[PDB]
Amino acid sequence: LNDLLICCRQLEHDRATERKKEVEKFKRLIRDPETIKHLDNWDAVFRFLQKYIQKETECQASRQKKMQEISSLVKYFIKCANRRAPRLKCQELLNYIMDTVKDSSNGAIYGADCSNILLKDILSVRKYWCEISQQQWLELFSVYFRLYLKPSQDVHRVLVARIIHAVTKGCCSQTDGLNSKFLDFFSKAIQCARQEKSSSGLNHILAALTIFLKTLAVNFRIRVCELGDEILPTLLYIWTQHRLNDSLKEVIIELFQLQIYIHHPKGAKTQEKGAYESTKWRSILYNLYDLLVNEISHIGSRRNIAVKENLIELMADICHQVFNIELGWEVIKDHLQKSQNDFDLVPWLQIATQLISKYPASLPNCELSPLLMILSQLLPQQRHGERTPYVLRCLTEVALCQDKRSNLESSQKSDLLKLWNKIWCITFRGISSEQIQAENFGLLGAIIQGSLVEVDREFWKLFTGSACRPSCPAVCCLTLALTTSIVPGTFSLKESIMKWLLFYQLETEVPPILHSNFPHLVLEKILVSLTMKNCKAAMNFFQSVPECSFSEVEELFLQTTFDKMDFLTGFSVHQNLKESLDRCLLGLSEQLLNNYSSEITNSETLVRCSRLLVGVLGCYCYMGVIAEEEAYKSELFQKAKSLMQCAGESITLFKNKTNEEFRIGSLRNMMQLCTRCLSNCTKKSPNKIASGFFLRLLTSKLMNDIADICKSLASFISTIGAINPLAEEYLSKQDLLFLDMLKFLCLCVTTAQTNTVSFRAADIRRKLLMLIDSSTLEPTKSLHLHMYLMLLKELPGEEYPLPMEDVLELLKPLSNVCSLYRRDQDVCKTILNHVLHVVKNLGQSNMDSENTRDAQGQFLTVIGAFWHLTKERKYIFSVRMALVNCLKTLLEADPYSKWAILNVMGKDFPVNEVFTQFLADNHHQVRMLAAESINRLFQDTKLKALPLKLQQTAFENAYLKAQEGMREMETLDEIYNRKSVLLTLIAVVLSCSPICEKQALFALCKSVKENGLEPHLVKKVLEK
């Protein structure tokens, strides 16, 4: 240890040539004992190295080589000191990098090397990426962008751009974000790109600009719109005059899409509906429409003839915003008719398909008949060309659009019926062509679903026989036909369809249904409905069961302008057919079971067959055909149990030896299928009964083997910036399989408590809780973090609460887990979003023992710690939003704040009083979330109203906070946002609480002339 200090003291001097020997010794003295002693030392050697660096630089080609070798020494030290773990102090290193890069006295290659080291050693480390303060981010951005604007053109410029990119991402993902005043910086760069032809690094600069606009669009919406109106013409000029490379074109397209999203949230056509309109924006829209039309007729826009999907989406959005220089659907019709080559016809078909699908109201009624006239002329070619699928998709979209309209005239209806019947006649021939069998059937469905064509006898013949093998589109068309048609007798047909569905080659060659995945409970419903006396009624009854990016910013925009407001808004079965179906299913199951081999057959086929059997049984049980108790004694249940027992052999074999790597895929597929089999919802559906049967199928040995495999796996030992520790790229195949098995076990435990099963849910739950033991779990491991988050999200349940000791076991390591990731914003947000699920079990107070208060304190202290850290401006708006969601859940759990009190600094705060504080936040999205969720303070939400005084006090406090938000006051956007927050709070109070209606109305009347609320906005809200 003393040797290093002596060597550093010697190196502090200035020798003529012995300093080279000292440097060689420094490079060569790094050994394992020295590294072990350095653990805390690195700061001192680093500052001594800085002394040497400044002394050496104090004293052309030779100087350039000296700079190169000194940079090599610096990077060698940096990679050696952090090779095992990030230990070097980061702020001083960032200061060193800034000092070396800002001055132009150093050589260009030396600055490039320093920037490369900053990019590859600092921004690539998660700890350094997360610990950097906002001021350092801003000064780094300024320094590294001022360098970019310099006229010195070299190879490092592109690299510099990359730096900015990374920095921008960091400043938008770890702090409050860059100020709006930085935007002009970006603008300057664009202006340079207007005259500079090389355009070395515009892609990275524009990607950083896109990230900045995405972050800055939530506020300052009008500012962003003005910036777009200022910038976009230059981008169009660059697109016209540049080389038209790939990455730059894609980034420009993405930026145009973002601008259109901001100007027209969710396709707001007019200003009164939410759009922001300007003459410059309209001219830009027309110019960009012309540019995209010109770009479509190009080889590079697409052997392949389809256009890239992003271009089609942008084109459809522009057309919707432009359509009423007519520029209407007649342009599309003319392009469809005039174009002869299929290369010039597919893009317009794609554009029409997207326009119809996204905006059905765009196409007027009067254009329905002519359009179908044109499309019917493109399809009937006897050979199926490369343009046939696109024509079929366009026809399907047109049919689905027509099905949604009810203001059609009788003559129009007759003409449409004639055209639909004709094109049905053309499209029916050639159905045997498998090459387009996915599209054809779908079109047929669109015809059948809308009842646009009467089904003939020959259509039913298509399903029977060997004309077409079963497939997902074919089965979907079949169930659509069964829903809105009556099967002709021609028993000979229903049994034929049943045999076709259940066909298996007699003596190997597994049936197509067992090979291809189908949507859950689709084959079983068809099979059951076939056997019933009234197939159409049974299918309708089955279908009648009740249901169990930048989009959110667009929804926030719509909410701010008050254009969207989420609030204030006897069967009989043929015995012979049933026996035939049972015989066919039993025969298929037996043929699968006896042919089974330990290696030859696949694992998921057995599970698919078992799922089919239990689904058929559950579909029978949903109606009155079969009884619950004697469905267990049926031979089908025994065969399904045997199939599952045979399937468990693979699990046992993998348990015997885990080192095998080729069995992971099949096990993962089987676990995913089993997870899909089970359901946790309880609404008296065939899915619930099928899930119960499947749960009863599983034996205790399989569950114990799965738990043992999970324990063994758990115990077993380009991108822009740092990688998120929760990223899936850190997970191997074994980790993914372990996560799938853990999810399956969690669902089994959660759903097993309702029913009775062979295995014991308590033992499996105890084994699961053994995984998060303090001695075993290390939060620093990504797999353990994923395991803990999955357990937190899955284990708690509302219908059947867990024992409070299990809740304590779940909550025990949470304090440490939050302690490790205090710095990371993304991990904190994920942790909050996952922990908000425990409040359902925490709120129970029937067994209010000491364990209940212990668990409640354990959770509330963590929530209060997060709130206290938030109050000190320590977390970004995402963590604040997650905290708001958690507090809303807490308010739902305990309306009266009997136990939900946050303790911090020796003081206590009720959750209700804390919640109203978020109405004066600095971010619009958090304020809107709080204002929209404020209704929890006036209703039980478990719908009985709260006492009078509580409601009065809550309304007064919320109104006062909303007033104070405005009271603390180019910046029209802030004023507009605060006014919208106030009006939204008043509207929510009016909609939810009938007691405070008069008070809310009087407050609105006062604020009309006191706060300067816009009369038209409040008028619209009051009208609604």
């Binding site: 304090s815 302690s819 304190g857 354990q858 202290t861 963590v862 710690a865 206290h868 850290l869 911090v904």
Partner: peptide, 10 residues
Amino acid sequence: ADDLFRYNPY
């Protein structure tokens, strides 16, 4: 600095 996260019954 980090003692806030820990739960203290006493």
